[PDB]
Design a binder for this molecule. Structure first.
Ligand SMILES: O=c1cc(O)n([C@@H]2O[C@H](COP(=O)(O)O)[C@@H](O)[C@H]2O)c(=O)[nH]1
Ligand SMILES: O=c1cc(O)n([C@@H]2O[C@H](COP(=O)(O)O)[C@@H](O)[C@H]2O)c(=O)[nH]1
Lengths: 257, 257
């Protein structure tokens, strides 16, 4: 009784950030998250502008931006609103609750002020979520839990993955889904986002492993593909994004029947 | 056949950063790491100056410093050299190798340029270490692996902890020890640093749990205590640091016999 993204956006227990996302995914016919893994603000912004219409989400690693300022993030928000995508800061909070609350709100980055979504590892126990929530709930943000990883030797398997799912389902006022390689929850209110995606077989030199959009979305039942180098390293990043968008979208449609 | 810190500093397989640390621990009679969990540079630096003689290490969370600049870190290095302690940036790298390499070297923080030590979660698999190593080995840095956590519901137990130990022992050119609640490796070349430490019983509201220096160092066989609030929240932070230093040092001596 699989529901479309648009119908999932209306589920009783849907989080507002999840709903906004699902609605724009349906509107734009995209379930592609760009992993904007660049070190220059101008490149980040030029990618966001050009690729904005093709993506549901732009994932950042703010801590690799050589020329980060809060003004850069203002500009990114303008593009996100214009083109209709969410901003996901891929910070992988992974500390005790008291620490992560400060890392989310404060410092130079002020992540909570501009990021629609963040994520967290579940290794510390649920305090990591509780700490983040203290900041994120008042700011109407959402969080993704890392239930599985794409890299060689990942320990996010078995009972670890199950613990992630339980933690999400117990903190559904804030947690909107997962970073995972497959569908890990049977509850349609939760988003599944899958990195480690390229059209061609392969990996990198540092433990990354790739699977295709058809595999991830079609066979493994995930919702969204997260793609970095498969787009960013291409000559024509717009065409690359469109190829990935079309692949992910068709895989979704076909699964829906 | 337990060895003193000074003797461990000379072990054939010791890492140079571990050796430097162990030597200054023995010289200064301190196995206390201050967790300098403050948001103001002036406070960070005033603590580093006053408490420097009492500590073997100062642990930072750079990403909570409201007024971070690289010049602040220059000033911290000056104090570290004057008073003889290492700087440990508690970044908890926890991504694929290709990402962490950039997060360690680059961005605004340029962590590798000033931090003697960093740490990593083992959840991604060994690529996290391999990526960090690409930056850290040329810069003569060291890394600690998070084998156990102090917080309620921690998943860093059992086979996860064992995996951390194996990963360390397989990357001994870069990995110098662990963040853990107890001795997890039988190899004396590896450092054990233990957070979740206060003199009094208790915890916090967000999953932290405390054990005493005598428990951690004496009974559980760790090397170094990491103390935040037990010092930072006290009126007289110098006296507090001295209490913690004396507690940890005596526990070590007694275990040594
Ligand atoms: O399991 C995971 C979780 C991630 O967030 N990521 C992230 O997704 C992106 C993958 O990038 P790429 O497509 O270039 O391999 C990176 O930013 C990485 O940090 C991942 O690769 N695997
Ligand atoms: O298992 C762990 C690992 C940590 O690094 N930490 C860190 O050690 C410090 C503990 O601080 P405190 O003593 O104030 O509870 C924090 O900076 C926290 O991020 C921890 O508490 N538990």
């Amino acid at each position: 009784m699989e529901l479309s993204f648009g119908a999932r956006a209306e589920l009783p227990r849907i989080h507002p950030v999840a709903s906004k996302l699902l609605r724009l995914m349906q509107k734009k016919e995209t379930n592609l998250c760009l992993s904007a893994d660049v070190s220059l603000a101008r490149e980040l912004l030029q990618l966001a502008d050009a690729l904005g219409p093709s993506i549901c989400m732009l994932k950042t690693h703010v801590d690799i931006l050589n020329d980060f300022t809060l003004d850069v993030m203002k500009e990114l928000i303008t593009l996100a609103k214009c083109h209709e995508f969410l901003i996901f800061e891929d910070r992988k909070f992974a500390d005790i609750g008291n620490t992560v609350k400060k890392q989310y709100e404060g410092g130079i980055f002020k992540i909570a002020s501009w990021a629609d979504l963040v994520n967290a590892h579940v290794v510390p126990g649920s305090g990591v979520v509780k700490g983040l929530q203290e900041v994120g709930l008042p700011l109407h943000r959402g969080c993704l839990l890392i239930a599985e990883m794409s890299s060689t030797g990942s320990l996010a398997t078995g009972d670890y993955t199950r613990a992630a799912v339980r933690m999400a389902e117990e903190h559904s006022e804030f947690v909107v889904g997962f970073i995972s390689g497959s569908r890990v929850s049977m509850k349609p209110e939760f988003l599944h986002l899958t990195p480690g995606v390229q059209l061609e077989a392969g990996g990198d030199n540092l433990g990354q492993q790739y699977n295709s959009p058809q595999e991830v979305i079609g066979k493994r039942g995930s919702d969204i593909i997260i793609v970095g180098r498969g787009i960013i390293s291409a000559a024509d990043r717009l065409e690359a994004a469109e190829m990935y968008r079309k692949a992910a979208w068709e895989a979704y449609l076909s699964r829906l029947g």
